[PDB]
Design a protein around this ligand. Structure first.
Ligand SMILES: O=c1[nH]cnc2c1ncn2CCN(CCO/C=C/P(=O)(O)O)CCP(=O)(O)O
Ligand SMILES: O=c1[nH]cnc2c1ncn2CCN(CCO/C=C/P(=O)(O)O)CCP(=O)(O)O
Ligand SMILES: O=c1[nH]cnc2c1ncn2CCN(CCO/C=C/P(=O)(O)O)CCP(=O)(O)O
Ligand SMILES: O=c1[nH]cnc2c1ncn2CCN(CCO/C=C/P(=O)(O)O)CCP(=O)(O)O
Ligand SMILES: [Mg+2]
Ligand SMILES: [Mg+2]
Ligand SMILES: [Mg+2]
Ligand SMILES: [Mg+2]
Ligand SMILES: [Mg+2]
Ligand SMILES: [Mg+2]
Ligand SMILES: [Mg+2]
Ligand SMILES: [Mg+2]
Lengths: 203, 207, 198, 197
């Protein structure tokens, strides 16, 4: 699927209807995707991943930093599947940051393996284009990408992930490990940042 | 606060986007309020409840059967607040059911247990408001210190007698919904999301 | 299966290592079964129930008041299996209390799961079992979070934990209506017994 | 003093029969016993989060995750801290990750989050680097601390569980990269040890 489509005229939710940390009370305009909705969608993505990749060992590759929450949660739902079903296949994990690929195991660990790349957001698609090209230099057996969010944008190079949580307008969103200048990662919901927030936290 | 307002024209979500019990697959039309959204809203309600009612022993009254899930979850969020704050208050629980013949209270403790306590009535849905006005009239006779009502859902309807609860999860259109313990002829309680039921479904489970 | 066997000499855990409501700080002696451990065991019980009772339609019967938490959580784990795995319920629910308030009068030809907080003398369970059986169900099974090792003049089909003959409270189990608002199962202290004595 | 000493697990702790829990099929033969149930980890971590906030909540916290084994404890501990921050009076928090085989820290309350302390060498090594970014304060939370005469004597500030000298896996802790995808902390069978060395 293209995922849960959040349309351009999505009002999202007033902050006052949810529990929000006091230190961000002025810096957010609206809740855009409630944490629990992310959980529900992620539960279903875990099933789609297993239906598609469950027949072999998987190396799940977390794209730090923004990917960390989605990754942990997605893997927790896969694990729940694995321990309540007859069949299960093991998973190993690894972590990388992009700048060139930094950190992470020798990517020869991906050689001949089924790789699941887990990302927070695809925008132009350039980052994923680049990572896919890098990973493929190490001859994995299979590579699929899961991204919590995919933006509708004219800048898209035309790359589309295999698993997508939500398809969103081109608004700047933060929360659930997504940041604005390292802030807002410590927020459970995805939210649209306000202009006041953009100015307080700009570098 | 009328709660999270769901508009008349809200399409809900395609079932294929979520994990749905197989046995209800063609009995539902859309997911209307995802479970997780109910959880997030309930977390805020627990905080609102403690702000108003946390000053004295609370008796939380579950209106069975449809109230049971919202009750368990709301109380769990309240317990989480109470074991992570400096000071806390005891909470006791009871369960009642209202039976239609005219409407009367079935079960529960002797209601003298309510005397002098902060009573929180927890309901799945307010529609006409007649059930709650009835329950409130009974409860008040036992002189609680205060009595407040939390309802997961409140329906916008012309048939409303004008009762509004103190705490509201979601304000919804005049559509028939099921899930999260709300039923259609006892079915659909075993579903985590609030959903709208299909034509195939209403027919299948019809009395 | 007798469930998770908690030995007679089990010391439990210091309260100060867990999150506990301050209003019960002096009323508990030890944490006995941490909430999270109840969840882990309950997850496995849900799978055992579905292995044995699914799929025909199940009516899950909640024995109030103490069974309410175990019932809600066990049913949540069963629902998780119903939407993620290769098998299904449907389930309907009812709630009974012994004081027999509620009940719908429904059980005939159905698979009935009685859900109980604790078996001690076994008397509530015998009563629930002669009830239900009068409506000729297709099958009856009993799930009990706790079973005490104590003399008992039916063995439950699904057991969370087999515990010593100690008075425990928490996870909806009460002492004179108190301690239901505690997520862990804990052993009540002497000062707790005196404070909330009726 | 240890700000939050841990659940002491005795040398003769027998753990739990695997058959009493939900275990991934692919590890059914490779594990011997459940040692620390996932849910027990969660309950301890909840109290740990409160202890952290009591000690460090007066100023911006930077939580530093020590990959790979620390990732689960880190995600969960931070989730509990976040819950405290939104149901209260709150303090901003930022995250970073480091792996052993950062101006984000300067002037802030740094919480290093680790899976296990054994000899203490790794933590002493890491501390000696982190201090060079001149934090306001540095604290270490470790899910597990092993009782070993081999301990160089280093003690973290927040401890989940103090365990005997046994090899454990699960909750992101690995044996040669295996067993990370397991929610419980477990002791590894003889067959799993030989199979994955
Ligand atoms: O709405 C947004 N919120 C937060 N970040 C956003 C957003 N849109 C684009 N970005 C940047 C996302 N990424 C930024 C890449 O760098 C991320 C490093 P980290 O913050 O450690 O996860 C680019 C995606 P593409 O190559 O497809 O254009
Ligand atoms: O959309 C709906 N879904 C499920 N049930 C609905 C709905 N609308 C009204 N109801 C009936 C709710 N109640 C029905 C009362 O009976 C209790 C239902 P149960 O929890 O299954 O024992 C009426 C409230 P009021 O007096 O304000 O009109
Ligand atoms: O250690 C204990 N803690 C709390 N309650 C205990 C305990 N032992 C027996 N009981 C009484 C349990 N009751 C439990 C059944 O119903 C629960 C009544 P309530 O939860 O207070 O509305 C009877 C057990 P049985 O009929 O097998 O003898
Ligand atoms: O029981 C165990 N299970 C898993 N690993 C264990 C265990 N005991 C020591 N270790 C090695 C842990 N660490 C190993 C560090 O490197 C491995 C980090 P990762 O990438 O998470 O696998 C040594 C700590 P210290 O300097 O205090 O001796
Ligand atoms: Mg990214
Ligand atoms: Mg960024
Ligand atoms: Mg109702
Ligand atoms: Mg009804
Ligand atoms: Mg009972
Ligand atoms: Mg009792
Ligand atoms: Mg480590
Ligand atoms: Mg290792």
């Amino acid at each position: 699927s293209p995922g849960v489509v959040i349309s351009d005229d999505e009002p999202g939710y007033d902050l006052d209807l949810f529990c929000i940390p006091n230190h961000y009370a002025e810096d957010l305009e609206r809740v855009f995707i409630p944490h629990g909705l992310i959980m529900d969608r992620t539960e279903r993505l875990a099933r789609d991943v297993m239906k598609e990749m469950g027949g072999h060992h998987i190396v799940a590759l977390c794209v730090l930093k923004g990917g960390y929450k989605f990754f942990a949660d997605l893997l927790d739902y896969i694990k729940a599947l694995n321990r309540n079903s007859d069949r299960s296949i093991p998973m190993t994990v690894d972590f990388i940051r992009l700048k060139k690929v930094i950190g992470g195991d020798d990517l020869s660990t991906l050689t001949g393996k089924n790789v699941l790349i887990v990302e927070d957001i695809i925008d132009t698609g350039k980052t994923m284009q680049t990572l896919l090209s890098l990973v493929r230099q190490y001859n994995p057996k299979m590579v699929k990408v899961a991204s919590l969010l995919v933006k509708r944008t004219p800048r898209s190079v035309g790359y589309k992930p295999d698993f997508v949580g939500f398809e969103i307008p081109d608004k700047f969103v933060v929360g659930y490990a997504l940041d604005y200048n390292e802030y807002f990662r410590d927020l459970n919901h995805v939210c649209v940042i306000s202009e006041t927030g953009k100015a307080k936290y700009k570098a």
